[PDB]
Design a protein around this ligand. Structure first.
Ligand SMILES: [Mn+2]
Ligand SMILES: [Mn+2]
Lengths: 161, 612
DNA sequence: TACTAAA
């Protein structure tokens, strides 16, 4: 059922629009949540996702983020290194990730070391944020135990730069 | 009725030393026609028969390669005929010293020749020049017995020289051919490019009239290094750091300035958030300690490159001036040969005696006596290129005896020698890790246990710092005055002589005796000026020249074509190629490059116009 | 009038 599929996506962690799931379905003969997720993962989020991230998260006020959800990375920059020398090893590696759900954009900082995310991460990949995530001064604090990479294959304009 | 042998050395000091070693105290010496070389006589046994000996020397190269007269006029030859339609002949160098006639008169009656020349690559070329000079005069062969010999040696002692005299061999022709090819290529490139550039820029812009614009396989890359450093300096965008530091006032007497684990943050908001989550705390909790033991390595044997670098950095002397001072000290009899590359003391060196001679100076008396009483540590093993032994002191000296310019060089040399012979430096490093809320901090300190060469080289010493307080994990200390500091990146400064020498050695541009010459040449041609701190700053002429070279054909400036050409020339040295073939191919490719260059000078003119 | 390099 459509309600069953939507609920399944709900506990899975994907918050997608009704028109998004209507557009992303293969054929309404026998639909499977697994194939829906697999085919949606390879597309852009701005056209299929919904609005679940609360407003004002860019600024303060809000303190904690609840729910696993799914976010899309737009850009990654190594904060602890200058722009000219991005391969310098004079500092511990800190990453600032610009994340989106299609409507509101947030910013996250690598509090601890994570190996599953690198500087050459293909833009457009999807991340799950299971657990309770700390919000400090409008910044999402990311740890290795509360971030999971779901992969991503969306057309890359990064190669141009 | 007994035959005579003739032995040629590359320098009179070497000739006299080898003659005195091989002749057990019996040596009759007299001057010759030149007045700059001496002839030594002795009687010995060679090839199983009694023989008279005659030892002499030649001052470096005997001949250098130059064009014929008609093509040395600069105004009657097109600077493109120099590549393939120009004969070249060898002409005497330093004509005041009649080397050819001296060798001819000294070798009138000899039967065997032994070449005691340097084991360098050009030693074989000098060997064959001497053989060309002497061979048509020697008294026949009287059968198939061999008359040409060559001895391989690297150290001037008793046993090494005796072994060299017992292990003779043959000379090599391919190395001489390689050196000749290198000489011909260098001449036919430099004299072709320089003529065209000088004759061009002296006819359009009058500001640089009566000035010489030179091109070569070394000067151009040397200038390129400096102008490329200038390019980095000009193309720089400063940024803004944000560093966080905190102070801990444990034991109510000391204030430790902790260092942030994360060294820098480039985002103001992230730095502010870290500061916000840290400053409202009144405790600092220790997490871990460390008491690792380390060691500072003693310096290696002295080398000409290291001596030049130290003279330029600390003593504040130019490379040419330092070389002149070293040469005067060597010829007066105070230091060894000042142009070596080896960084490895020979196994038969008299280290104990050389250290024992300098046991009366008030500066080193205690250290030398302690070393001689408690034994000497063996020197570090290093490169053993068979050129010459490293630079070591040879006689005692005092500040009154030597001048105020050579005394500093002698002091540095003897201090380096004692440091190489001496022990190592041991220091205990202590690091203490603090936690103030989420973040981490570290505090580091050093404490020396047993100084080694430090007392001989006080500038290479670990600084004295207060010992870190004792603390075990779980203790808590009061923390106060945590704050955020803002810093900006600093642009790099112009190249120094030490850095330029390091780069030239790394890229294989220039030899041991060529780096000062090239630096002085690029300074004299007004390409680069010398400023405070021994820094080389490019001028407008150098900048425009290198930029035009890059725009037209970069292969003339990049510091790898010299290495590629050396690799290509090594083929005939190893016998895997042909001299004519390699020389023709290289000359053809460079001629094509020159023809592409000649009809594209407007690219350099358009940059010359704005400058001048 | 020189030039290039190398002992
Ligand atoms: Mn030599
Ligand atoms: Mn050499």
């Amino acid at each position: 059922m459509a309600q069953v599929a939507g609920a399944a996506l709900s506990q899975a962690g994907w918050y997608l629009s009704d028109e998004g799931i209507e557009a992303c379905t293969s054929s309404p003969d026998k639909v499977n949540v697994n194939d829906i997720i697999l085919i949606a993962l390879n597309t852009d989020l701005r056209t299929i996702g919904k609005k679940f991230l609360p407003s004002d998260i860019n600024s303060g006020k809000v303190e904690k983020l609840e729910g696993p959800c799914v976010l899309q990375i737009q850009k990654i920059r190594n904060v602890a290194a200058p722009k000219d020398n991005e391969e310098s090893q004079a500092a511990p590696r800190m990453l600032r990730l610009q994340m989106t759900d299609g409507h509101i954009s947030c910013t996250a900082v690598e509090f601890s070391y994570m190996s599953k995310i690198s500087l050459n991460t293909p833009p457009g990949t999807k991340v799950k944020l299971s657990g309770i995530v700390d919000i400090k001064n409008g910044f999402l604090l990311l740890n290795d135990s509360n971030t999971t990479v779901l992969g991503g294959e969306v057309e890359h304009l990064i190669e141009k730069w | 009725v007994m035959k005579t042998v003739l032995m040629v050395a590359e320098m009179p000091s070497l000739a006299q030393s080898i003659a005195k070693i091989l002749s057990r105290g019996s040596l009759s010496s007299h001057k010759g026609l030149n007045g700059a070389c001496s002839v030594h006589e002795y009687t010995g046994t060679f090839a199983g028969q009694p023989v008279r000996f005659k030892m002499t020397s030649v001052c470096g190269h005997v001949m250098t390669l130059d064009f014929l007269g008609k093509y040395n006029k600069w105004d009657k030859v097109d600077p493109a005929e120099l590549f393939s339609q120009a004969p070249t002949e060898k002409k005497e160098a330093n004509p005041k010293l009649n080397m050819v006639k001296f060798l001819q008169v000294e070798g009138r009656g000899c039967d065997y020749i032994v070449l005691w020349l340097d084991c360098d690559k050009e030693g074989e070329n000098i060997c064959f020049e001497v053989l060309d000079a002497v061979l048509p005069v020697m008294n026949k062969a009287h059968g198939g017995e061999k008359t040409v010999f060559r001895a391989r040696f690297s150290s001037i002692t008793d046993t090494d020289i005796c072994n060299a005299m017992a292990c003779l061999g043959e000379p090599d022709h391919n190395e001489a051919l390689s050196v000749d090819a290198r000489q011909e290529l260098d001449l036919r490139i430099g004299c072709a490019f320089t003529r065209f550039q000088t004759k061009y820029f002296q006819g359009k812009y009058g500001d640089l009239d009566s000035s010489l614009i030179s091109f070569g396989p070394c000067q151009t890359p040397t200038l390129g290094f400096c102008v490329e450093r200038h390019d980095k300096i000009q193309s720089f965008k400063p940024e803004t750091y944000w560093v966080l530091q905190a102070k801990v006032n444990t034991d109510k007497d000391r204030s430790l300035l902790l260092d942030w684990d994360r060294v820098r943050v480039f985002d103001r908001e992230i730095a502010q958030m870290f500061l916000n989550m840290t400053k409202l705390e009144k405790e600092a909790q220790v997490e871990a300690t460390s008491r690792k033991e380390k060691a500072k390595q003693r310096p290696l044997a002295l080398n000409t490159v290291e001596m030049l670098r130290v003279a330029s950095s600390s003593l504040g002397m130019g490379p040419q001036h330092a070389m002149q001072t070293a040469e005067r000290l060597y010829t007066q009899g105070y230091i060894s040969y000042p142009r070596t590359e080896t960084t490895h003391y020979p196994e038969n060196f008299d280290l104990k005696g050389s250290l024992r001679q300098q046991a009366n100076h008030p500066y080193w008396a205690d250290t030398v006596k302690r070393l001689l009483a408690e034994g000497i540590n063996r020197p570090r093993k290093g490169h053993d290129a068979g050129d010459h032994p490293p630079i070591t002191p040879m006689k005692s000296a005092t500040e009154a005896e030597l001048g105020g310019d050579a005394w500093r060089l002698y002091e540095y040399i003897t201090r380096h020698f004692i440091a190489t012979v001496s022990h190592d430096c041991k220091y205990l490093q202590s690091t203490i890790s603090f936690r103030i809320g989420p973040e981490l901090f570290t505090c580091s300190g050093k404490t020396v246990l047993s100084p080694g060469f430090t007392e001989v080289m006080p500038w290479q010493s670990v600084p004295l710092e207060e010992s870190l307080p004792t603390c075990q994990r779980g203790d808590a200390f009061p923390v106060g005055e945590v704050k955020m500091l803002e810093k900006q990146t600093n642009p790099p400064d112009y190249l120094t002589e030490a850095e330029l020498i390091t780069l030239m050695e790394k890229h294989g541009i220039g030899t041991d005796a060529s780096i000062p010459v090239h630096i002085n040449n690029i300074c004299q041609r007004n390409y680069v000026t010398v400023e405070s701190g021994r820094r080389l700053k490019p001028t407008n002429l150098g900048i425009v020249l290198v930029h035009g070279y890059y725009k037209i054909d970069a292969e003339l400036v990049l510091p790898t074509i010299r290495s590629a050409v050396e690799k290509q020339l090594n083929l005939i040295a190893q016998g895997k190629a042909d001299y004519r073939q390699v020389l023709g191919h290289t000359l053809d490719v460079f001629k094509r490059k020159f023809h592409y260059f000649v009809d594209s000078i407007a690219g350099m003119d358009e940059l010359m116009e704005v400058s001048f």
